[PDB]
Amino acid sequence: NGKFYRGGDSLALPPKKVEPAKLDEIISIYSDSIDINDRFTFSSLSLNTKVSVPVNGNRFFNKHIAIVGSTGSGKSHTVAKI
Amino acid sequence: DDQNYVKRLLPDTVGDITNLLPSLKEGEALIMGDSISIPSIVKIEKCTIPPSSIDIKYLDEWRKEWVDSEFDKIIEQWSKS
Ligand SMILES: Nc1ncnc2c1ncn2[C@@H]1O[C@H](COP(=O)(O)OP(=O)(O)O)[C@@H](O)[C@H]1O
Numbered sequence: 001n002g003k004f005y006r007g008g009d010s011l012a013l014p015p016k017k018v019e020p021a022k023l024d025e026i027i028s029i030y031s032d033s034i035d036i037n038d039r040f041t042f043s044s045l046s047l048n049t050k051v052s053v054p055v056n057g058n059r060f061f062n063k064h065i066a067i068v069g070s071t072g073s074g075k076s077h078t079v080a081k082i
Numbered sequence: 083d084d085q086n087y088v089k090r091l092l093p094d095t096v097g098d099i100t101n102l103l104p105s106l107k108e109g110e111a112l113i114m115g116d117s118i119s120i121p122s123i124v125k126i127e128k129c130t131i132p133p134s135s136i137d138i139k140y141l142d143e144w145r146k147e148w149v150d151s152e153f154d155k156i157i158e159q160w161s162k163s
Pocket residue numbers: 069070071072073074075076077078
C-alpha cells in the first residue's frame with residue numbers, strides 16, 4: 001500500500017508477474033525512511049531522474065563525509081553542489 | 083620494481099596490464115590521464131629529426147680489417163677532459 005519495508009529473504013512463490021516499478025514505489029524506498037523535515041536532497045537516481053534520493057540531513061553532516069573519485073569525475077562539483 | 087611503482091600510482095588501468103608493460107614494442111606507449119579520456123595504447127610517430135641513434139653497428143664493423151685506431155688524439159682529448 002505504497003510504504004516500503006526493507007526485508008531479507010522474503011519469499012514469493014513462482015510464477016509471479018514482473019513489471020518495472022512505477023514512480024511511487026521507487027520514491028518510497030528513499031523518501032519514506034527519512035522524516036520529511038530531515039530530508040536533504042543533492043542528487044537523484046541515475047536510472048530514474050524523477051526519483052530523488054534524499055539523505056538524512058542531520059546524520060549526513062554530523063557523521064563525516066568522504067567524497068572520493070578520480071580526477072575529472074566531478075568531485076569538486078559534488079562538493080560545491082552539497 | 084618499476085612496474086609495481088608505476089601501476090600503483092597510475093591513475094587508471096587497462097585490461098591485462100601486468101604483462102603488458104614488458105611486451106610494449108619499440109616506440110609503443112600507454113597514455114592515460116585527464117588530458118585523454120580513454121587510456122589507449124599508442125605508437126609514437128617516428129621522429130624525422132631524431133636524437134641521433136647511438137647504436138654502433140657491431141658485427142660488420144668487426145667483420146672489416148683491423149683498423150689502426152689513432153690513440154694519440156684519443157688520449158689528448160682524454161687529457162683535457
Ligand atoms: N552532477 C553532474 N552532472 C553532470 N556533469 C558533471 C556533474 N558533476 C561534475 N560534472 C562534470 O565533470 C567535470 C569534472 O569536474 P570535477 O568533478 O570538479 O573534477 P574533479 O573531480 O577533478 O575536481 C566538470 O567539468 C563537470 O562539468
